[PDB]
Design an enzyme around this catalytic site. Structure first.
Site, PDB file in Angstrom:
ATOM      1  N   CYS A 106     -35.081  -8.388  26.004  1.00  0.00           N
ATOM      2  CA  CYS A 106     -34.355  -8.751  24.789  1.00  0.00           C
ATOM      3  C   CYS A 106     -32.895  -8.365  24.927  1.00  0.00           C
ATOM      4  O   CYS A 106     -32.572  -7.193  25.118  1.00  0.00           O
ATOM      5  CB  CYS A 106     -34.961  -8.073  23.545  1.00  0.00           C
ATOM      6  SG  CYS A 106     -34.032  -8.426  22.018  1.00  0.00           S
ATOM      7  N   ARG A 109     -30.816  -6.242  21.653  1.00  0.00           N
ATOM      8  CA  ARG A 109     -31.274  -4.922  21.237  1.00  0.00           C
ATOM      9  C   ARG A 109     -30.187  -3.977  20.747  1.00  0.00           C
ATOM     10  O   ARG A 109     -30.469  -2.803  20.516  1.00  0.00           O
ATOM     11  CB  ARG A 109     -32.024  -4.239  22.377  1.00  0.00           C
ATOM     12  CG  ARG A 109     -33.426  -4.744  22.635  1.00  0.00           C
ATOM     13  CD  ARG A 109     -34.014  -4.005  23.826  1.00  0.00           C
ATOM     14  NE  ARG A 109     -33.592  -4.586  25.100  1.00  0.00           N
ATOM     15  CZ  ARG A 109     -33.649  -3.969  26.278  1.00  0.00           C
ATOM     16  NH1 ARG A 109     -34.091  -2.720  26.353  1.00  0.00           N
ATOM     17  NH2 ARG A 109     -33.253  -4.603  27.385  1.00  0.00           N
ATOM     18  N   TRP A 278     -32.329 -13.179  14.579  1.00  0.00           N
ATOM     19  CA  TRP A 278     -31.602 -14.433  14.501  1.00  0.00           C
ATOM     20  C   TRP A 278     -31.355 -14.971  15.924  1.00  0.00           C
ATOM     21  O   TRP A 278     -31.430 -14.234  16.912  1.00  0.00           O
ATOM     22  CB  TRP A 278     -30.278 -14.256  13.764  1.00  0.00           C
ATOM     23  CG  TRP A 278     -29.423 -13.192  14.377  1.00  0.00           C
ATOM     24  CD1 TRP A 278     -28.635 -13.300  15.504  1.00  0.00           C
ATOM     25  CD2 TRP A 278     -29.270 -11.850  13.910  1.00  0.00           C
ATOM     26  NE1 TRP A 278     -28.007 -12.106  15.751  1.00  0.00           N
ATOM     27  CE2 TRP A 278     -28.378 -11.198  14.791  1.00  0.00           C
ATOM     28  CE3 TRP A 278     -29.794 -11.136  12.825  1.00  0.00           C
ATOM     29  CZ2 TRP A 278     -28.003  -9.867  14.617  1.00  0.00           C
ATOM     30  CZ3 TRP A 278     -29.424  -9.817  12.655  1.00  0.00           C
ATOM     31  CH2 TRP A 278     -28.533  -9.195  13.543  1.00  0.00           C
ATOM     32  N   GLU A 283     -30.856 -20.465  23.084  1.00  0.00           N
ATOM     33  CA  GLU A 283     -32.296 -20.554  22.864  1.00  0.00           C
ATOM     34  C   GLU A 283     -32.711 -21.928  22.362  1.00  0.00           C
ATOM     35  O   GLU A 283     -33.717 -22.470  22.804  1.00  0.00           O
ATOM     36  CB  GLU A 283     -32.745 -19.496  21.884  1.00  0.00           C
ATOM     37  CG  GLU A 283     -32.657 -18.100  22.448  1.00  0.00           C
ATOM     38  CD  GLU A 283     -33.216 -17.078  21.482  1.00  0.00           C
ATOM     39  OE1 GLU A 283     -34.441 -16.866  21.516  1.00  0.00           O
ATOM     40  OE2 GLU A 283     -32.430 -16.511  20.696  1.00  0.00           O
TER      41      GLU A 283
END
Ligand code: HEM
Ligand code: HEM
Ligand SMILES: CNCc1cccc(OCc2ccc3c(C)cc(N)nc3c2)c1
Ligand SMILES: CNCc1cccc(OCc2ccc3c(C)cc(N)nc3c2)c1
Ligand SMILES: C[C@H](O)[C@H](O)[C@H]1CNc2nc(N)[nH]c(=O)c2N1
Ligand SMILES: C[C@H](O)[C@H](O)[C@H]1CNc2nc(N)[nH]c(=O)c2N1
Ligand SMILES: [Zn+2]
Lengths: 407, 411
Positions: A106, A109, A278, A283
């Site tokens: 991720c 983070r 969000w 993506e």
């Protein structure tokens, strides 16, 4: 064994000691790296409890206190008796935040400590689950000003009473296979879209149809529920220079909320724990729109741009890819829906790595996932060496429910 | 033990058995992955099994395993080792070794070409001047008036580690870099340290933004000597853009021949510390890394200004947009001047086909995803969605310390 990581753009070197706390395994060996592979009892439970409680009471500067020892005693007693045990609210919240903190894949983070945790452990039914999920979605969406959240359903007991959300995300578009051979909507979801329809759902057979929730409480058969449309915020995708772009017919949802993962805290397994933040622009615009086994709009978009699609070396795919991602960011921003571009998010992550090395002694990270799917080397994380290792508490993958469910 | 990798775009699944032959180590453990770490005097004791393993491989490939030729060779090397504490490769074995070092190079996307390698045996070389002559012929041969040919020139192996042959240049052709008093850099910032050495060694720098560096060559452990490649041998390409006519005015060019000269070739335990090899460029090597890395020529800003992009917020993706045009311009210029080059789409597609073929004929293809995936547009190339296994086979190309850090100066 006190490892060093180098940024080759800035010559900054960080020392990693945190990795020595690692417990779980990577799938690599000294003979072979699997760094790019997508997916690598009472006695079992108490070391896990102890380790978690140890790090929790250390985090609140009460290591080796009465309250520490007492809790270790209390959970130890409870494990002995009930073969499981229950997390104090404080522990639940700590565990959830730290699972995200420890998510090596991720990039987002830096936000890890500002997570809103919804304790849904009193839930008993699918209707109940639906209610909790609706409240999650409404809270996280916040009329476009998104807020990170997680809703935690009851922990696994004997594996026969599992709570599961069958959707992969709370919000996703359906996938239908045409008789003509192609695919309408999202091809990633064709199998699930089938199972929805195969379970009662009536599909509009459209291109962007929000899937129904398929909710499983206490191990029972899963139930279909439709999310109130007014809770599903969507962004119409237009380009800031190309007025023909709106005519492509594209939109996306604002809330990325992953629902198929398993949250592990102190050995306890939460098989149903949908969480949301969000989006990073890529993506949607790189992966969701331009992946070949997805919406794969590259060819049509380039044709509208009238590019020389004859030879690959014109980099027309590259050009179109950029413009599409320009549009996605522009659309969200225009409608005041939270979104982050890959430059901003990767720069944040480097600052976050810095912070974690400095205050924690390291930050587990998976270069193969952290580096964005476009413009890799002009983002700072590309030139950043990263150590990947598995810390607990964690989010883990789990089998798809239909393969497992005893109907 | 069998191992599977999956392409997630095509669902093609491949099974690796080749990883079983892997001897060297990765840097990783069951507890840590070092998959993105850039870099994670040998006695008769450990040298014969290395020789035996190599010769076993060699004679297998030529379908003569266990033949009298195989055994006699084994015997021959054995005696020569204990007698002389090293051994010499046959020409055939050297050529085999070089090609397989490339074949095993898990960070190289261009290995579909591995069997077409022109091997130049420079083991009779003794002096820097001799090295310069050999290197000159390499460059001319490889350049081929723009129709590039893969080649490698192999100098004598290491003996006692005190008589190494080394090319001090990281590449045979590279541009000078100059740090100015005001802290700015003129030329290629990646080559500032090496430029300084050359200057110190007596090179007279033109001090322009694209000065080809001199060769600095070390034979038999002696102090290195300076040589100027004849300019007529250095093929360069002015960079222009097919639509943006202001692009020529940016003043950019690059050289046509990528030729890496600082790596070490290992064959059957023997170490070849000077072994310059060359192929042709993938466009992004120049357009993405050499031009747009912040620590390189870093031209994104000027190109973005000239394109008049919204450079106020990064979410305008002005960086991305400029990167693409720059890489378009690199491909355009090379193709226009009929200098061999390949875009990242073609090269990655070729690699997948190569890799699939290697799994079927060889039982695997070691590959470093972190390096194989191109530095722009990663997920629209097919290698992004490809699971890969990384492990180390020999023969191999290895990193070695920069010689100015280890060299004993004679004077
Ligand atoms: C707040 C903004 C956030 C951003 C911008 C962000 C960004 C990303 C991105 C780009 C990925 C790559 C995933 C893919 O390509 O499919 C990812 C993965 C992941 N994120 Fe974050 N994320 C955010 C919040 C969160 C939160 C709140 C959680 C959990 C509480 C979380 C947990 C994870 C996990 C576990 C993965 C890896 C999933 C896997 O292994 O497949 N993220 N994130
Ligand atoms: C013929 C066309 C070739 C192409 C298009 C090609 C392409 C590439 C590229 C793009 C890289 C990554 C470079 C970087 O980012 O620094 C690379 C690495 C590499 N190439 Fe190839 N290559 C070619 C030929 C060769 C040849 C002839 C050899 C040796 C005989 C070779 C051996 C290697 C090795 C050992 C690496 C890894 C370098 C490292 O570990 O730092 N390549 N190649
Ligand atoms: C399809 N890729 C593998 C996979 C499997 C299961 C879940 C996956 O989701 C990745 C993911 C998870 C959470 C995200 C959150 C919370 C925010 C965000 N912007 N992206 C995410 C992206 C991916
Ligand atoms: C400084 N970057 C790491 C590094 C160190 C030493 C050598 C390196 O070489 C990369 C490389 C090597 C050979 C190449 C060949 C033969 C052709 C090509 N197109 N690119 C190459 C690229 C890279
Ligand atoms: C930190 C990271 O390993 C480093 O920046 C690597 C990543 N991948 C790369 N890939 C290629 N082809 N070339 C490189 O120089 C690098 N650099
Ligand atoms: C095969 C390869 O590991 C796979 O395509 C990975 C690569 N990196 C990724 N990175 C992110 N952020 N998300 C992904 O889904 C993937 N997929
Ligand atoms: Zn690894």
């Amino acid at each position: 064994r006190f490892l060093k990581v180098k940024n080759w753009e800035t010559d900054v070197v960080l020392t990693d000691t945190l990795h020595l706390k690692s417990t779980l395994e990577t799938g690599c060996t000294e003979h072979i790296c699997m760094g790019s592979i997508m997916l690598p009892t009472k006695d079992q439970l108490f070391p896990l409890a102890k380790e978690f409680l140890d790090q929790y009471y250390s985090s609140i500067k009460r290591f080796g206190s009465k309250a520490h020892m007492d809790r270790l005693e209390e959970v130890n007693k409870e494990i002995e008796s009930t073969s499981t045990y229950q997390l104090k609210d404080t522990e639940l919240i700590y565990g959830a935040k730290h699972a995200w903190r420890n998510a090596s894949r991720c990039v987002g983070r830096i936000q890890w400590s500002k997570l809103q945790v919804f304790d849904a452990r009193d839930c008993t039914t699918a209707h109940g689950m639906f209610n909790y999920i609706c409240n999650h979605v409404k809270y996280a969406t916040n009329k476009g000003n998104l807020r990170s959240a997680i809703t935690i359903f009851p922990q696994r007991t004997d594996g026969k009473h599992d709570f599961r959300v069958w959707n992969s995300q709370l919000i996703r578009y359906a996938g239908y296979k045409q008789p003509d051979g192609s695919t309408l909507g999202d091809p990633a979801n064709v199998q699930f879209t089938e199972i929805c329809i195969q379970q009662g759902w009536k599909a509009p057979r459209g291109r962007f149809d929000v899937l129904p929730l398929l909710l499983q409480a206490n191990g029972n058969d899963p139930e279909l529920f439709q999310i109130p449309p007014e809770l599903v915020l969507e962004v119409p995708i237009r380009h800031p220079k190309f007025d023909w772009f709106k005519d492509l017919g594209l939109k996306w949802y604002g809330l990325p909320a992953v629902s198929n993962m398993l949250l592990e805290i102190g050995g306890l397994e939460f098989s149903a724990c949908p969480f949301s933040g969000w989006y990073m622009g890529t993506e949607i615009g790189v992966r969701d729109y331009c992946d070949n086994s997805r919406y794969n709009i590259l060819e049509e978009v380039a044709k509208k741009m009238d590019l020389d699609m004859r030879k690959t070396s014109s980099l027309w795919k590259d050009q179109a890819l950029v413009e599409i991602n320009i549009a996605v960011l522009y659309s969200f921003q225009s409608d005041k829906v939270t979104i982050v571009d890959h430059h901003s998010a990767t720069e944040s992550f480097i600052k976050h790595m810095e912070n974690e090395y400095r205050c924690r002694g390291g930050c587990p990270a998976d270069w193969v996932w952290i580096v964005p799917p476009m413009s890799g080397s002009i983002t700072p994380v590309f030139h950043q060496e990263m150590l990947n290792y598995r810390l607990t508490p964690s989010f883990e993958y789990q089998p798809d429910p239909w393969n497992t469910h005893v109907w």
